[PDB]
Amino acid sequence: AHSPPGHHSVTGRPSVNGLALAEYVIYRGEQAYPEYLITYQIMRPE
């Protein structure tokens, strides 16, 4: 798709099994810059 007329992106807030967390979508590559590269592992819980 693209962005709706007059608009520049799409905020959304889908709910999975009751939990709602904010997605953000854009439709032009140049609208985001990848400033930090983060290397990591998920930590195992004791």
Binding site: A1, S3, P4, G6, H7, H8, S9, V10, T11, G12, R13, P14, V16, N17, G18, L19, L21, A22, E23, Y24, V25, I26, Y27, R28, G29, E30, Q31, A32, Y33, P34, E35, Y36, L37, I38, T39, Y40, Q41, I42, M43, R44, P45
Partner: protein, 159 residues
């Protein structure tokens, strides 16, 4: 033309990004099926990404969007996870590769919560899991996330 500046963990830049990673973790209500089971991360490396071409490609666009939005770029720091980060950090984000079967269409998706992005490191729903163990809840393999400057401008709320 990209280069990676490494941040020391005593650097306050490092500490803010790390804190942002850790503090945005949430308990996804699929029991950890896509991203794994965890509360905290082990943060191995934080690298700043310097590429002037992509930087100016970005700011220039943010100015275009700002004129269209009452002189507000509506900028945000947001996470992004996908199996293509090594491409993205060299060539820049590219809509021509967008997630075509997403909720909100062929777009480039970002997240507030780091753990939410984490769910997409190894594909949609994690799919298979890590390249080496096929374990979507692997604590051995290293993962990678991007922490990006995203220009939202005037954003449409959907669904």
């Amino acid at each position: 033309g990209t280069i990676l500046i490494d941040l020391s963990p005593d650097d306050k830049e490092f500490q803010s990004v790390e804190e942002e990673m850790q503090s945005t973790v949430r308990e996804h209500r699929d029991g950890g099926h896509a991203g794994g089971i965890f509360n905290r991360y082990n943060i191995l490396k934080i690298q700043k990404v310097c590429n002037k071409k992509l930087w100016e490609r970005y700011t220039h666009r943010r100015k275009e969007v700002s004129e269209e939005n009452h002189n507000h770029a509506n900028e945000r720091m947001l996470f992004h996870g996908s199996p293509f980060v090594n491409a993205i950090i060299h060539k820049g984000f590219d809509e021509r590769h967008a997630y075509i079967g997403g909720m909100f269409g062929a777009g480039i998706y970002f997240a507030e919560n780091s753990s939410k992005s984490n769910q997409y490191v190894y594909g949609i729903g994690g799919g298979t899991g890590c390249p080496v163990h096929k374990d979507r809840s692997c604590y051995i393999c290293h993962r990678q996330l991007l922490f990006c400057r995203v220009t939202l401008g005037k954003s449409f709320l959907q669904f």
